[PDB]
Design a protein around this ligand. Sequence first.
Ligand SMILES: *[C@@H]1O[C@H](CO)[C@@H](O[C@@H]2O[C@H](CO)[C@@H](O)[C@H](O)[C@H]2NC(C)=O)[C@H](O)[C@H]1NC(C)=O
Ligand SMILES: *[C@@H]1O[C@H](CO)[C@@H](O[C@@H]2O[C@H](CO)[C@@H](O)[C@H](O)[C@H]2NC(C)=O)[C@H](O)[C@H]1NC(C)=O
Ligand SMILES: [K+]
Ligand SMILES: [K+]
Ligand SMILES: [K+]
Ligand SMILES: [K+]
Ligand code: NA
Ligand code: NA
Ligand code: NA
Ligand code: NA
Ligand code: NA
Lengths: 316, 316
Amino acid sequence: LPSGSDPAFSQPKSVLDAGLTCQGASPSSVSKPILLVPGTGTTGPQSFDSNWIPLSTQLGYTPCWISPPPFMLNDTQVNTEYMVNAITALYAGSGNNKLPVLTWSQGGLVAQWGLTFFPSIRSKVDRLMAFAPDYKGTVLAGPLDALAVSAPSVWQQTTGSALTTALRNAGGLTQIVPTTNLYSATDEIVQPQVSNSPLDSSYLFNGKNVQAQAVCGPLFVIDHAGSLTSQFSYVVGRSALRSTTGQARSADYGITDCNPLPANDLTPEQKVAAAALLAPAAAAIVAGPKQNCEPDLMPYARPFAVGKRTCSGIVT
Amino acid sequence: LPSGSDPAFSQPKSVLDAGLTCQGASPSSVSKPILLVPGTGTTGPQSFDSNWIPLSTQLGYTPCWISPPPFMLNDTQVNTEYMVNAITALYAGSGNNKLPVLTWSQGGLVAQWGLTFFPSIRSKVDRLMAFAPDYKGTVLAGPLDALAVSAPSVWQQTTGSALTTALRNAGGLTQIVPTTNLYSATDEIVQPQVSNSPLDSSYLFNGKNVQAQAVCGPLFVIDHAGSLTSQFSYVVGRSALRSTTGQARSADYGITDCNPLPANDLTPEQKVAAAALLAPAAAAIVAGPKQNCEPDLMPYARPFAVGKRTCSGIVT
Ligand SMILES: *[C@@H]1O[C@H](CO)[C@@H](O[C@@H]2O[C@H](CO)[C@@H](O)[C@H](O)[C@H]2NC(C)=O)[C@H](O)[C@H]1NC(C)=O
Ligand SMILES: *[C@@H]1O[C@H](CO)[C@@H](O[C@@H]2O[C@H](CO)[C@@H](O)[C@H](O)[C@H]2NC(C)=O)[C@H](O)[C@H]1NC(C)=O
Ligand SMILES: [K+]
Ligand SMILES: [K+]
Ligand SMILES: [K+]
Ligand SMILES: [K+]
Ligand code: NA
Ligand code: NA
Ligand code: NA
Ligand code: NA
Ligand code: NA
């Protein structure tokens, strides 16, 4: 696991700060922040307005989020700069108090990439609650890559990519801070997820790895978006957020919570938007960037993916 | 459309027969046969053991398949002899009753080549259910082969080929029996498929042409193999097989069926095998025969591709 200096950011501070917002507050002076990191094809509000922005507010946090442009479709490594900058800011802005990070989809990969390569944030994040994280990527992006209809970050989120290779070889498939990963065998976006084991894309060694079918039964069905928005997900997320260990606890949820529909505390109208969470993501992918190769690794990550091929050639 | 005698077989009938197998039945005495025609780089079992063999069984059919050697890599015109012989056999063996044909990839090109050039089988095929058929071939020169260093049937499936030209000029891009074509914009092997129109390689005039994204949305992703194996594909195929019209019916499927993962009725082990369909087929193509020209058209097809080039020169 890297333990030296932080890499320098490629983006200026003005740019990174512009991508961070808090509800009703400035990052420079915020009470009990939670940092929300969005999924592929979305802004922070698009991922979370119908779900964890109001739910976290009801738990007493001030939700804050990043929106790396365009819609989380550019280089995951740059998406991570937004996250690292935001944790630094929000920690300073809330009294040097550690804060939680809550993610969907790629946001969890971004969080873990940041924790792996930017040691400074490890003391600033108290826990990670990741919904449907793709730490191994997804095999399902393969045809899109072959067709050259994949955005930068979609290439990076393909199983076997240089990015996912680097994360693994740097030690990033082991939890770094207390981590809960909630995911589903029936996720239609991220696979493989079926095994309830380290083979799954969402699994981290020493983490609290919650495959919904383990709790709720193998026949249980909960999709990629539902993995973020469901009542089951709310109970698990609340467990993680409240737990003194920094991980969800099996005592905190069971069969009575195995409701895949949008969280009960959401208003009717929020439930409608939550259920429809993935539509705007699909439309952003559709209009968004597309290329025929995986973006290059930044220098700090190259040693961890020697021999993989990116846009510029083979990593040496 | 051609309307006379069937072309003579180039292969002995014993050889053709030996390539036909049914599950649990002789072709001479079979209950409700369905004939399965595999994709390039596979035998019948390799295409269908994880999918339409069990899925058709559960629908009450006896699955039967052909396995033209080696692995569907030889002349598509010879592959078609196996299909024509099998239809003749299974029609008689089911009491002189027409039977459905269900195909993947090249198998659909084979079925339509047979229906176009071998008139005797038209009255013996109840309906055709083709998954990812490449009636126009493909424009994508994939990464398996050096350009123009390819197997016989790979040449023939290249857009612009003499074979695909002949099919078109003989009238074979119009359905001959009731046909449903299920295909995907995100097919990484066969393109173009993106338009939901007669541009697409899988489209037949007067057919029931089902591009999955037209139903499911633009980021519904199923690949060339997923076109055969997905739950969405199963719902459409079941509709096609049951329909009184011989074609799938839009009433039978909709957004709720839009699951790209392997068909729900497959066991956990069959789903893993279905999701792994493509890689060993691609490896069989890589390991297979290579030549530097397209196989010659048989005499009965030449007049429909005059001016195209095969191994013996420009067709006359
Ligand atoms: C998208 O990611 C790329 C790649 O990391 C960013 O482009 C780099 O930006 C740095 C900072 O200016 C440059 O030094 C490199 O030359 C850039 N590389 C490439 C290939 O262009 C880019 O800034 C990111 N875009 C956004 C909107 O964040
Ligand atoms: C593969 O296809 C070629 C047709 O392209 C077949 O070869 C022909 O076989 C007939 C029947 O014996 C011969 O009369 C021809 O002279 C052959 N032509 C060529 C170019 O060799 C061949 O039999 C097929 N192989 C298999 C295993 O089916
Ligand atoms: K700001
Ligand atoms: K304040
Ligand atoms: K507790
Ligand atoms: K019709
Ligand atoms: Na399940
Ligand atoms: Na290039
Ligand atoms: Na094979
Ligand atoms: Na040719
Ligand atoms: Na099984």
